[PDB]
Amino acid sequence: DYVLYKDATKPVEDRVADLLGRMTLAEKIGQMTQIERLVATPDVLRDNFIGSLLSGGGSVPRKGATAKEWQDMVDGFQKACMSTRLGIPMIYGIDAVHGQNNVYGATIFPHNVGLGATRDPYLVKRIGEATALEVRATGIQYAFAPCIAVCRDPRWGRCYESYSEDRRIVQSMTELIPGLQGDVPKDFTSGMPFVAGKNKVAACAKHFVGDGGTVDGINENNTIINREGLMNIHMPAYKNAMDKGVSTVMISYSSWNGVKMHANQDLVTGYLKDTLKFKGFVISDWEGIDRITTPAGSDYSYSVKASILAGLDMIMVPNKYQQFISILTGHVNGGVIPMSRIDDAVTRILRVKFTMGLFENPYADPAMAEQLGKQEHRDLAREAARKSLVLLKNGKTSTDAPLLPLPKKAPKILVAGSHADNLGYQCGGWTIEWQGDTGRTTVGTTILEAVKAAVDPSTVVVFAENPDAEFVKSGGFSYAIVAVGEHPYTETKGDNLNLTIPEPGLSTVQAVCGGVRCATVLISGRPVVVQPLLAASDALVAAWLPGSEGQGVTDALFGDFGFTGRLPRTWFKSVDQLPMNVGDAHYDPLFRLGYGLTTNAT
Numbered sequence: 001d002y003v004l005y006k007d008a009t010k011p012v013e014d015r016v017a018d019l020l021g022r023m024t025l026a027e028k029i030g031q032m033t034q035i036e037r038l039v040a041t042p043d044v045l046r047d048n049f050i051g052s053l054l055s056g057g058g059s060v061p062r063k064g065a066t067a068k069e070w071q072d073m074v075d076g077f078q079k080a081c082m083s084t085r086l087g088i089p090m091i092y093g094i095d096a097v098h099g100q101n102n103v104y105g106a107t108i109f110p111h112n113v114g115l116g117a118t119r120d121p122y123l124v125k126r127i128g129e130a131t132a133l134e135v136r137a138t139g140i141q142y143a144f145a146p147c148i149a150v151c152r153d154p155r156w157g158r159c160y161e162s163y164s165e166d167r168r169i170v171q172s173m174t175e176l177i178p179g180l181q182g183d184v185p186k187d188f189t190s191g192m193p194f195v196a197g198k199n200k201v202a203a204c205a206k207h208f209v210g211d212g213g214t215v216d217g218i219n220e221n222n223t224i225i226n227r228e229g230l231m232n233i234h235m236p237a238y239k240n241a242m243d244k245g246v247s248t249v250m251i252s253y254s255s256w257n258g259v260k261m262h263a264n265q266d267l268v269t270g271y272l273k274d275t276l277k278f279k280g281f282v283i284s285d286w287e288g289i290d291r292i293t294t295p296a297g298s299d300y301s302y303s304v305k306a307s308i309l310a311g312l313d314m315i316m317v318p319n320k321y322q323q324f325i326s327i328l329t330g331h332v333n334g335g336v337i338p339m340s341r342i343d344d345a346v347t348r349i350l351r352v353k354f355t356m357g358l359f360e361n362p363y364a365d366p367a368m369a370e371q372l373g374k375q376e377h378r379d380l381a382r383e384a385a386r387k388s389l390v391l392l393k394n395g396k397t398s399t400d401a402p403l404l405p406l407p408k409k410a411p412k413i414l415v416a417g418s419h420a421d422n423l424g425y426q427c428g429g430w431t432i433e434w435q436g437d438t439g440r441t442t443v444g445t446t447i448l449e450a451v452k453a454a455v456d457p458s459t460v461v462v463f464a465e466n467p468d469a470e471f472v473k474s475g476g477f478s479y480a481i482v483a484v485g486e487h488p489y490t491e492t493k494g495d496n497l498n499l500t501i502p503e504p505g506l507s508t509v510q511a512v513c514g515g516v517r518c519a520t521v522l523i524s525g526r527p528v529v530v531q532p533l534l535a536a537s538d539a540l541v542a543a544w545l546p547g548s549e550g551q552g553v554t555d556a557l558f559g560d561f562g563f564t565g566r567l568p569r570t571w572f573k574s575v576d577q578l579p580m581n582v583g584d585a586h587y588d589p590l591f592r593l594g595y596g597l598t599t600n601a602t
């Protein structure tokens with residue numbers, strides 16, 4: 001007879017209920033399973049009724065693969081899923097944290113900390129829109145963004161993924177969600193999931209909760225703070241996410257007062273689900289449940305029980321699905337985990353899938369392939385890059401002539417530094433590779449390239465990665481642009497207790513600036529010991545991790561636009577002051593939050 005759940009003209013809730021009521025335990029648990037593409041097969045996906053696949057950092061079908069290659073890969077996995085008895089389409093997830101960053105040729109936008117410096121939520125919203133198009137351009141329908149952590153200690157390797165240390169700024173930036181998913185209807189209830197259609201993607205608010213408040217900025221560690229602070233600082237943005245209809249929420253590896261988030265039923269079910277009324281699905285982090293126990297995985301059975309009972313709906317296994325599905329099946333077959341729990345998880349997962357139209361459009365649209373790296377997106381990124389720059393110094397003394405804007409016409413100029421012509425360094429972590437990379441890893445424009453594309457044709461441009469003092473003094477230069485900073489990093493490989501950029505960097509700035517007036521471009525995902533760099537430079541700009549569009553940097557250096565960016569974090573005098581945020585009693589910053597010199601277009 002008639003099959004309600006397959007009827008597109010029927011309400012989401014009715015369809016969910018109809019489909020759920022037909023599912024077997026194996027099919028229900030399968031929906032709760034998310035596996036890495038590396039361990040997926042048509043048989044595996046079909047036989048285990050897999051509900052979702054993801055692509056971890058760097059997990060690509062081929063280096064430099066095209067948009068169609070991605071679409072083909074996703075579709076291949078989908079055909080397998082659509083062939084099951086119920087034909088429930090899978091949702092493919094990926095880390096498009098600043099563009100479809102794993103994908104080659106994809107537009108790379110400035111990382112969040114830089115976006116916070118723009119104080120322009122609408123811009124961030126437009127980036128979310130561009131990002132959705134580029135993610136769908138590769139056939140993917142789910143982005144693990146935005147990260148709305150409120151980084152409170154720069155020593156955190158993931159601080160660049162935090163818009164600001166001030167939650168009011170992080171809140172304003174949740175506009176990325178409607179950009180990615182689309183604007184929610186005027187009626188809309190806070191907490192319901194939403195996705196406009198096949199041209200949008202389901203978003204993810206992560207990492208619930210307090211991931212940006214770990215002691216000493218140690219990643220995945222403990223966040224020691226009263227419930228007032230937890231709710232005053234780390235919780236606010238999630239409510240905005242609820243109001244804007246975020247589709248999913250990922251749990252944090254971090255603990256809150258000794259308790260693992262992946263096991264905290266009070267917050268996940270009690271607060272997020274019951275209090276906040278979140279109706280989308282809650283997903284774990286990469287082996288997040290394994291880490292509930294220490295050693296990690298030392299009691300996977302306990303890990304599955306604790307996390308599921310806590311309230312999580314989908315688990316990012318993401319490799320040993322056999323064990324996950326086996327163990328969870330036993331716990332259910334044994335009464336250790338009630339069917340209501342399983343039925344709730346599946347309800348939430350199916351609600352999200354029906355709502356976003358996955359049952360109507362399970363396959364990729366070949367016509368979206370051109371969206372990947374569309375010039376307009378690059379122009380947008382370029383704009384974001386420029387607007388995220390923060391001018392810290394612009395003249396050695398109160399009476400010096402302002403160095404920036406620099407003249408586009410000069411006899412001979414010098415571009416130098418380890419970050420002057422290194423697209424990978426410029427993009428930072430979460431780009432092509434998980435930990436990011438060095439060199440020309442994708443399609444873009446380096447600072448050196450941008451400079452050459454901006455100057456007058458009569459202007460001779462010379463490049464030196466690390467020239468010595470003499471080379472500069474006898475070079476007959478009019479001025480120099482030196483770029484230096486941190487190297488790409490992600491998560492733990494990024495935690496740093498000394499926060500001083502690697503060498504050569506300072507030496508290059510001192511050697512260059514000693515020979516000719518200079519403008520130092522500091523590439524970093526956070527504030528770093530900067531007094532020595534300021535000492536040597538005539539002008540210095542904090543460019544954060546601008547992304548693939550280097551011209552955004554020169555658009556400001558050469559006066560096409562005036563600097564407008566303002567520090568989205570506190571800039572410390574020394575690491576021993578940390579933690580140290582705006583509003584603290586001992587607040588003695590080198591540059592207070594909100595600081596930013598300005599200039600006007602020529």
Ligand SMILES: *[C@@H]1O[C@H](CO)[C@@H](O[C@@H]2O[C@H](CO)[C@@H](O[C@@H]3O[C@H](CO[C@H]4O[C@H](CO)[C@@H](O)[C@H](O)[C@@H]4O[C@@H]4O[C@H](CO)[C@@H](O)[C@H](O)[C@H]4NC(C)=O)[C@@H](O)[C@H](O)[C@@H]3O)[C@H](O)[C@H]2NC(C)=O)[C@H](O[C@@H]2O[C@@H](C)[C@@H](O)[C@@H](O)[C@@H]2O)[C@H]1NC(C)=O
Pocket residue numbers: 438487488489493494495496497498499500502503504
């Ligand atoms: C302040 O704390 C930080 C973090 O604790 C510390 O940096 C870390 O230092 C570790 C060792 O001291 C280092 O581990 C070794 O890494 C080697 C490879 O490292 C290169 O490649 C990775 C990416 O694969 C980059 O992240 C690294 O920055 C490094 O990159 C190369 O760096 C050189 C020097 O500038 C440059 O000429 C190359 O072009 C560049 N190439 C690349 C790939 O970009 C391994 O082979 C080895 O087995 C260890 O695992 C960490 O990687 C590093 N963390 C990061 C992200 O930088 C920092 O230490 C200072 O800086 C490092 C780079 C090194 O020069 C130290 O001697 C120096 O002291 C520390 N600073 C202070 C104040 O002590």
Ligand SMILES: *[C@@H]1O[C@H](CO)[C@@H](O[C@@H]2O[C@H](CO)[C@@H](O[C@@H]3O[C@H](CO)[C@@H](O)[C@H](O)[C@@H]3O)[C@H](O)[C@H]2NC(C)=O)[C@H](O)[C@H]1NC(C)=O
Pocket residue numbers: 218220221222255258294
């Ligand atoms: C927060 O971070 C701290 C510091 O990284 C964590 O402490 C560390 O905990 C691990 C185990 O969880 C300790 O590992 C050692 O392992 C060997 C065997 O592998 C064992 O013989 C040692 O006795 C020890 O367990 C490590 O020593 C310890 N580091 C120190 C000195 O503090 C802490 O567990 C993290 N907590 C949270 C909330 O994540």
Ligand SMILES: *[C@@H]1O[C@H](CO)[C@@H](O[C@@H]2O[C@H](CO)[C@@H](O)[C@H](O)[C@H]2NC(C)=O)[C@H](O)[C@H]1NC(C)=O
Pocket residue numbers: 562563564598599600601
């Ligand atoms: C020169 O630059 C200043 C600094 O940005 C401009 O003033 C800002 O203008 C923005 C809007 O463009 C306002 O939101 C800010 O409040 C202003 N900042 C302050 C305190 O001045 C100024 O309009 C620019 N003038 C020209 C001719 O471009």
